[PDB]
Amino acid sequence: PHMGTSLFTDRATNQLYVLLSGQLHPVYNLTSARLVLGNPANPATVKSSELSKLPMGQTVGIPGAPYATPVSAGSTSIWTLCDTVARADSTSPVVQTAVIAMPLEIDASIDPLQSHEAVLVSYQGETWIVTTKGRHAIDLTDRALTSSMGIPVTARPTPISEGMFNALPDMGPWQLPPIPAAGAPNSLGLPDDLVIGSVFQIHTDKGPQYYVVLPDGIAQVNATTAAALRATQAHGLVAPPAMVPSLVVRIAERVYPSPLPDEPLKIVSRPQDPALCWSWQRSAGDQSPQSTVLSGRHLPISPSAMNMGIKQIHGTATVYLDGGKFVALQSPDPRYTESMYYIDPQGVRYGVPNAETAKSLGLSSPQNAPWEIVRLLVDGPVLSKDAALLEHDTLPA
Ligand SMILES: [Ca+2]
Ligand SMILES: [Ca+2]
């Protein structure tokens, strides 16, 4: 019968020994011992003379596994990816990347982009504009489009890392939404001058409200969008004609999804603000995560935290965390795939193949996390019972 203790530690050496079918085996770590036992056993301390009372076998386990699988007390799952560009204005700008899995300290020196703020970046020979929503493709050699869309010739793109490029959602071209049948007569009963794609205005209590004429109705646009439309094609109008509300209220209203913000676009200076981050967060009970783009002078963590960073030899990012993590990912690989990883305090991810294995390790309720950030971590060996059952020549250290 099972006698309650299948895991032991030599009182003198603190070495681990696991009991398998009446025989002791040295085992590399607690993680491996629990994998083979099928439950998160805690070692019983005994003298070597006690261990010598059982037959001893070869070393078992996963030597590359973390010693154990502790997890930070964690209120909320928070994951942040940060690009820092060194010598942004030089002929040799360099991007460094950090993964932050811990609460942030946000201030005026490093905070979310505001709605009118944007960063011009380069990736693989192409340029993208980064806003609070993600990245938008733009070709800067198209001087007129670029200018109309609020981007000055004084703007210099700076490189983003591959990880940041993957993390930032492609929200579509930085352009005015194309207007079908632009230039053609309106079908809305408006004056002949107001062709499809033209801009008019009506006077309100808050002053002028601008509209664009669409094939299926009229849509409100802000002043910036109105100017951008007219800068591209004014349709022969010196200014947006003033219309009477009696004429306009009768027409179907539509939505024109211009990406241009109300205020003049402010292009952040990378030398001033070398840090660009994508921060992702989700609390237990939440139906959706919330994500935002940060821009500032350094990482959004305390100065004390700025040197608890760890970079793996074969990792791309320096990792900052407040303890271990147990996370659940969902990704199209290319089919919708749910996966689980344990992340050790060193910033290595280890696959947890199924719920049964998680239970063996004493891991429960994995936090939802973004694969875009988590899979940037170095991938260690999968934590499986099959792997842990393997015998080895050499004793644990
Ligand atoms: Ca600062
Ligand atoms: Ca700011």
How many C-beta neighbours within 10 Å does residue 76 have? 11
SS3 at position 278: strand
Tell me: do 193 and 260 sit in the same domain. yes
φ/ψ bin of 222: left (φ > 0), alpha (ψ from -120 to 50), beta (otherwise): beta
CA 145 – CA 139 distance, rounded (Å) = 8
Per the CB < 8 A criterion, the answer to whether 5 and 37 are in contact is: no
CA 39 – CA 18 distance, rounded (Å) = 12
Q: Which ligand is nearest to the CA of 302?
A: 1
Taking alpha carbons only, the member of 88, 125, 101, 130 closest to residue 113 is 130
Distance 153 CA to ligand 1 centre (A): 29
How does 326-356 read in b/e, with b if 16+ C-beta sit within 10 Å?
bbbbeeeeeeeeebbbbbbbbbbbbebeeee
Please give the backbone phi and psi of residue 305, each rounded to the nearest 5 degrees, phi first: -70, -25
Tell me: do 185 and 260 sit in the same domain. yes
How does 7-16 read in b/e, with b if 16+ C-beta sit within 10 Å?
bbbbeeeebb
Amino acid at 386: D
Distance 271 CA to ligand 2 centre (A): 14
Per the CB < 8 A criterion, the answer to whether 101 and 78 are in contact is: yes
Q: Domains in the chain: how many in total? A: 5
CA 75 – CA 233 distance, rounded (Å) = 53
Burial class (CB in 10 A: 0-12, 13-18, 19+), 236: exposed
- Which helix (H) or strand (E) element contains residue 311? strand 310-311
Q: How far is CA 116 from CA 89, 113, 151, 209, 224, in A?
A: 23, 8, 12, 20, 11
Per the CB < 8 A criterion, the answer to whether 96 and 84 are in contact is: yes
Asked whether the bond before 240 is cis by omega within 30 degrees of 0, the reply is no
Domain-ending residue, one of 147, 175, 203: 175
Distance 4 CA to ligand 2 centre (A): 58
- Which helix (H) or strand (E) element contains residue 168? none
Domain-ending residue, one of 124, 141, 175: 175
CATH of the domain at 38: 3.30.2390.20
CA 50 – CA 54 distance, rounded (Å) = 8
Q: Which ligand is nearest to the CA of 112?
A: 2
Tell me: do 190 and 254 sit in the same domain. yes
SS3 at position 196: coil
Tell me: do 188 and 249 sit in the same domain. yes
CA 232 – CA 235 distance, rounded (Å) = 9
Tell me: do 259 and 197 sit in the same domain. yes
CA 142 – CA 223 distance, rounded (Å) = 22
Tell me: do 104 and 160 sit in the same domain. no
Tell me: do 191 and 233 sit in the same domain. yes
CA 347 – CA 358 distance, rounded (Å) = 19
Q: Which ligand is nearest to the CA of 303?
A: 1
CATH of the domain at 196: 2.40.50.910
Q: Which DSSP letter does residue 360 get?
A: H
Residues 6 or more apart whose CB falls under 8 angstroms from that of 337 comprise 330, 331
CA 61 – CA 42 distance, rounded (Å) = 16
Q: Which ligand is nearest to the CA of 276?
A: 2
CA 124 – CA 128 distance, rounded (Å) = 11
Q: Which residue has the tokens 């733009």?
A: 138
Q: Which residue has the tokens 């022969």?
A: 236
Distance 135 CA to ligand 1 centre (A): 25
Resolution of this structure in Å:
1.9
Distance 102 CA to ligand 1 centre (A): 18
Per the CB < 8 A criterion, the answer to whether 39 and 19 are in contact is: no
Distance 112 CA to ligand 2 centre (A): 6
Residues 6 or more apart whose CB falls under 8 angstroms from that of 143 comprise 153
Q: How far is CA 139 from CA 96, 147, 338, in A?
A: 25, 11, 37
CA 167 – CA 373 distance, rounded (Å) = 7
Distance 192 CA to ligand 2 centre (A): 46
Amino acid at 53: K
Tell me: do 242 and 184 sit in the same domain. yes
CA 290 – CA 282 distance, rounded (Å) = 6
Tell me: do 102 and 140 sit in the same domain. no
Report how this structure was experimentally obtained: X-ray
- Which helix (H) or strand (E) element contains residue 379? strand 378-379
CA 332 – CA 121 distance, rounded (Å) = 26
Q: Which residue has the tokens 């260690």?
A: 380
Burial class (CB in 10 A: 0-12, 13-18, 19+), 205: exposed
How does 237-256 read in b/e, with b if 16+ C-beta sit within 10 Å?
eeebeebeeeebeebeeeeb
Tokens for 11? 């009182």
Please give the backbone phi and psi of residue 85, each rounded to the nearest 5 degrees, phi first: -95, 125
Distance 298 CA to ligand 1 centre (A): 6
Taking alpha carbons only, the member of 379, 377, 381 closest to residue 318 is 377
Taking alpha carbons only, the member of 273, 278, 267, 268 closest to residue 298 is 273
Per the CB < 8 A criterion, the answer to whether 42 and 63 are in contact is: no
Calculate the CA 252 to chain-centre distance.
39
Distance 283 CA to ligand 1 centre (A): 27
Strands of 275-282's sheet in order across: 110-112, 290-296, 275-282, 77-86, 94-101, 317-321, 310-311
| Greatest Cα-to-Cα distance within the chain, rounded to the nearest angstrom | 102
Q: Which residue has the tokens 């340029």?
A: 127
CA 202 – CA 148 distance, rounded (Å) = 23
Distance 333 CA to ligand 2 centre (A): 35
SS3 at position 330: strand
Tell me: do 109 and 153 sit in the same domain. no
Distance 309 CA to ligand 2 centre (A): 24
Tell me: do 371 and 389 sit in the same domain. no
Distance 115 CA to ligand 2 centre (A): 11
Tell me: do 118 and 104 sit in the same domain. no
Tell me which residues have their CB within 5 A of the ion that is ligand 2.
111
Distance 106 CA to ligand 1 centre (A): 9
Identify the domain containing residue 280 by its residue range.
Answer: 69-113+265-324
Tokens for 210? 């601008």
DSSP string of 238-277?
SSPPB--HHHHTTSPEE-------SSPPEE--TTT--EEE
Taking alpha carbons only, the member of 118, 173, 122 closest to residue 145 is 173
Distance 262 CA to ligand 2 centre (A): 17
Strands 253-254 and 266-267: unpaired
Tell me which residues have their CB within 5 A of the ion that is ligand 1.
109, 297
Domain-ending residue, one of 148, 175, 202: 175
Distance 272 CA to ligand 1 centre (A): 11
Q: Which residue has the tokens 């709605």?
A: 115
CA 52 – CA 17 distance, rounded (Å) = 11
CA 121 – CA 295 distance, rounded (Å) = 13
